[PDB]
Amino acid sequence: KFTPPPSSLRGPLVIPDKIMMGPGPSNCSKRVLAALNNTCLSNFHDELFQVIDEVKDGLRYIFQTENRTTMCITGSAHTGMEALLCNLLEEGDIVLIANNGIWAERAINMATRYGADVRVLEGPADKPFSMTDFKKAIEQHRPKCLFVVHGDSSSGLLQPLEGLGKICHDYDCLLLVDAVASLCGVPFYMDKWEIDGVYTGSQKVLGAPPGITPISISPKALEVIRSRKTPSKVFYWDLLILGNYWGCYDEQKRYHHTVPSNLIFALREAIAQIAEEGLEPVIRRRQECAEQMYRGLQAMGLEIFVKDPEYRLPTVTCIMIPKGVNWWKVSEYAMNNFSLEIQGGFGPTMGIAWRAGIMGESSTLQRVNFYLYAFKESLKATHP
Amino acid sequence: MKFTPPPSSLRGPLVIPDKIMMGPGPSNCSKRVLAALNNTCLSNFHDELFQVIDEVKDGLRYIFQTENRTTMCITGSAHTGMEALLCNLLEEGDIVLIANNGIWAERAINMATRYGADVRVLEGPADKPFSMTDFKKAIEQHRPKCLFVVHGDSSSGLLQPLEGLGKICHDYDCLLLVDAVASLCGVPFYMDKWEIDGVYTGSQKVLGAPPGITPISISPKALEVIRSRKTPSKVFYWDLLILGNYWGCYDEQKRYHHTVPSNLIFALREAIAQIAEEGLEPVIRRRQECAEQMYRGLQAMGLEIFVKDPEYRLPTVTCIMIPKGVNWWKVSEYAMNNFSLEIQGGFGPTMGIAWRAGIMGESSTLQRVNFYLYAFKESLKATHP
Numbered sequence: 001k002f003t004p005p006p007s008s009l010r011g012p013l014v015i016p017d018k019i020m021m022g023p024g025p026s027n028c029s030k031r032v033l034a035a036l037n038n039t040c041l042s043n044f045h046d047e048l049f050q051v052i053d054e055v056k057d058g059l060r061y062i063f064q065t066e067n068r069t070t071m072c073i074t075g076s077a078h079t080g081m082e083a084l085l086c087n088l089l090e091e092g093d094i095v096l097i098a099n100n101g102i103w104a105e106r107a108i109n110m111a112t113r114y115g116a117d118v119r120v121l122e123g124p125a126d127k128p129f130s131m132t133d134f135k136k137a138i139e140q141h142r143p144k145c146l147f148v149v150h151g152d153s154s155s156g157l158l159q160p161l162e163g164l165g166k167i168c169h170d171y172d173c174l175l176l177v178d179a180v181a182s183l184c185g186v187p188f189y190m191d192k193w194e195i196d197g198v199y200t201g202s203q204k205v206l207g208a209p210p211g212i213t214p215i216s217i218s219p220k221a222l223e224v225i226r227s228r229k230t231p232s233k234v235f236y237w238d239l240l241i242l243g244n245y246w247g248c249y250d251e252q253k254r255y256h257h258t259v260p261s262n263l264i265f266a267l268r269e270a271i272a273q274i275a276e277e278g279l280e281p282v283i284r285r286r287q288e289c290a291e292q293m294y295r296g297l298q299a300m301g302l303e304i305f306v307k308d309p310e311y312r313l314p315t316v317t318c319i320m321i322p323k324g325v326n327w328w329k330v331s332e333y334a335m336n337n338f339s340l341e342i343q344g345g346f347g348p349t350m351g352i353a354w355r356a357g358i359m360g361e362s363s364t365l366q367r368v369n370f371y372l373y374a375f376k377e378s379l380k381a382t383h384p
Numbered sequence: 385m386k387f388t389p390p391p392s393s394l395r396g397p398l399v400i401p402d403k404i405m406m407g408p409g410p411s412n413c414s415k416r417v418l419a420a421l422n423n424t425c426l427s428n429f430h431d432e433l434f435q436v437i438d439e440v441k442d443g444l445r446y447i448f449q450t451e452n453r454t455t456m457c458i459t460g461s462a463h464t465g466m467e468a469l470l471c472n473l474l475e476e477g478d479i480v481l482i483a484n485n486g487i488w489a490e491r492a493i494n495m496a497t498r499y500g501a502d503v504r505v506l507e508g509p510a511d512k513p514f515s516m517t518d519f520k521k522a523i524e525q526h527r528p529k530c531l532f533v534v535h536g537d538s539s540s541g542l543l544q545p546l547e548g549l550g551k552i553c554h555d556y557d558c559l560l561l562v563d564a565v566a567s568l569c570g571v572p573f574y575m576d577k578w579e580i581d582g583v584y585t586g587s588q589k590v591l592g593a594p595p596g597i598t599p600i601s602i603s604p605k606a607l608e609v610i611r612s613r614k615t616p617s618k619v620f621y622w623d624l625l626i627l628g629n630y631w632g633c634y635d636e637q638k639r640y641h642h643t644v645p646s647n648l649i650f651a652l653r654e655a656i657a658q659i660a661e662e663g664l665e666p667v668i669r670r671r672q673e674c675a676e677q678m679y680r681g682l683q684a685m686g687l688e689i690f691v692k693d694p695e696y697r698l699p700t701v702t703c704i705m706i707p708k709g710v711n712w713w714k715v716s717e718y719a720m721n722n723f724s725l726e727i728q729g730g731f732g733p734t735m736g737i738a739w740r741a742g743i744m745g746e747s748s749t750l751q752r753v754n755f756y757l758y759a760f761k762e763s764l765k766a767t768h769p
């Protein structure tokens with residue numbers, strides 16, 4: 001005797017192809033999606049350990065670090081933010097957060113939740129912080145950790161990082177960076193920029209399925225986690241024990257949790273494509289695409305949230321909605337008529353812009369010209 | 385740009401062979417379930433994804449057996465189910481009782497300490513379950529906010545009866561929380577009938593779906609406890625009041641929470657559908673029957689089972705006692721190299737003294753059990769004459 005099954009599961013799974021040029025999930029390649037179609041291996045199968053070691057080598061490549069303490073967390077990229085703050089901060093520890101968009105606000109939320117003394121450097125969403133802004137705020141607050149968003153997908157803002165680590169280190173402070181939307185889209189040098197903790201997202205520039213999160217921490221950062229008098233609040237992403245299974249220490253592997261092998265298979269292959277082509281050509285192609293996007297947008301009389309090109313994040317461009325234009329009518333027509341994802345605004349850009357992403361397989365000149373055409377045609381047909 | 389160069393290990397191709405997965409480990413997924421992964425990673429606000437989501441919620445209500453509006457998934461492996469229940473329901477200083485006769489309860493003791501709880505333990509041996517008396521005593525003693533039970537223990541091969549337990553817990557104003565990872569769709573389970581306040585399962589165990597997405601459900605009484613909380617829970621990522629918002633469990637406009645793993649949610653949809661098609665009961669009946677055969681064939685090898693009373697065995701995991709002077713690894717190795725069969729070693733209470741045989745996913749067939757039994761046999765003979 002059971003309550004009978006619902007009728008909503010009687011039909012098939014039907015997902016159409018979409019051209020995914022939000023900042024959202026990106027298009028993954030054929031090679032990457034085929035990698036999902038494999039045995040969900042055991043935690044302790046040799047073939048899985050092999051894939052994990054290759055993935056760690058690949059992450060040290062795309063992060064540009066020698067950090068042994070390089071792994072994935074099982075979850076979305078939020079998970080990276082959670083783990084850096086959860087692990088590195090005890091009750092009362094002072095964290096400084098540079099806030100000019102919604103991802104800082106998330107970080108402010110979590111750090112309060114883990115019981116930290118949160119200090120906030122506030123700024124306008126459309127301009128970056130100067131080294132002078134950071135120095136004063138570190139002097140004032142004398143924080144254990146600084147948290148900074150590198151590429152803000154909610155603004156289209158790229159925060160320059162050259163020298164912030166030296167400054168952080170002069171004041172005995174760890175430097176933590178979100179590189180979810182920035183990595184493989186612009187130059188990034190974890191070690192030379194003296195970053196003590198970074199994470200990215202599988203579904204942004206890498207063009208891999210969501211659900212698995214690259215993370216890396218510095219020897220200094222490992223040392224602070226080892227020093228803690230109190231245990232971190234979450235077993236699931238305690239980096240001393242997750243690190244163990246990921247074979248980051250001089251220890252026998254122990255079962256911690258069941259890793260999403262299929263997702264990890266897809267991530268290996270995604271890194272492989274970037275290694276094959278080379279990190280520098282991949283970044284340049286994304287840079288060239290963004291130039292083309294700016295040229296086309298200029299030709300159409302449309303503006304960009306971040307006015308100063310120097311400080312624009314190439315992978316996410318926030319296109320301003322002109323007076324008299326309904327944004328959702330454009331987005332809805334594009335999807336319905338071209339299968340194009342033209343995503344609305346978010347955080348500081350809510351209500352005032354669309355977000356145009358150049359990530360994964362949509363990082364080509366041909367995809368950029370189809371975006372502006374479809375966008376243009378979607379305006380005209382919804383506003384005459 | 386002068387980047388450190390890429391590693392040569394990425395130069396070659398990915399090669400993941402087919403394996404028969406009859407550990408408790410991950411299971412074999414059907415063709416249909418794996419194919420589902422191969423689809424567009426959708427936006428969090430695409431109608432199509434919202435549709436699949438509603439179908440996952442309907443199908444979860446089915447296999448959990450509940451009308452709970454607060455049914456959803458956590459993005460993560462099943463440990464996330466244990467995290468989120470303890471995390472959401474326990475404030476600094478609240479009192480939690482944890483029935484402990486296995487490694488999954490040790491994990492729950494580890495998590496609950498970290499979250500700042502007053503942890504009480506009811507200890508007991510791994511190879512027999514708790515009486516309703518045993519619970520009732522423990523519940524009087526400690527008068528706790530929540531009790532936490534493992535329904536199906538993949539470390540032992542033990543199944544814990546639950547009929548009655550709900551009404552006892554509620555009498556003392558205590559919530560009942562259950563781990564149904566290794567038991568859901570393997571044995572009967574009635575979330576509402578049995579007055580359960582919190583359950584989760586795993587995608588990779590009985591359902592035969594890929595790991596990474598974790599179904600969870602909480603009662604209207606549990607929801608009210610969380611809303612009553614005097615402090616905010618410690619983890620935004622699995623705060624059910626806001627995760628629950630995106631999954632459309634509440635009378636609020638949907639807000640973005642996190643990027644859900646659309647591909648794993650699609651595979652989960654299909655896995656639930658496979659079970660809906662044949663029907664819950666036939667599916668459970670087939671797995672019971674498979675276990676029966678497994679016991680009869682183990683009996684005919686003169687091998688023993690950690691959990692001695694059949695009335696207390698979990699059919700989905702059977703721990704097979706290593707005979708004295710038998711090298712377990714030499715068996716398991718030969719099983720893998722000659723048959724591509726996973727014969728998993730022991731873990732927790734059963735480490736050093738068992739293999740663990742699983743009847744899960746697409747290996748839940750007579751034909752596959754009969755294959756395990758044959759391959760085990762040949763493996764022993766060839767490595768221990």
Ligand SMILES: *Cc1c(COP(=O)(O)O)cnc(C)c1O
Pocket residue numbers: 076077078079103149151152153178179180181201204210641642643
């Ligand atoms: C998308 C994004 C996140 C959140 O990651 P999810 O996988 O969506 O949970 C965090 N930080 C930045 C910069 C992002 O672009």
Ligand SMILES: *Cc1c(COP(=O)(O)O)cnc(C)c1O
Pocket residue numbers: 257258461462463464488534536537538539563564565566586589595
């Ligand atoms: C395997 C298992 C877990 C752990 O789940 P993961 O998906 O590996 O994180 C928890 N509980 C039970 C009963 C299990 O069998």
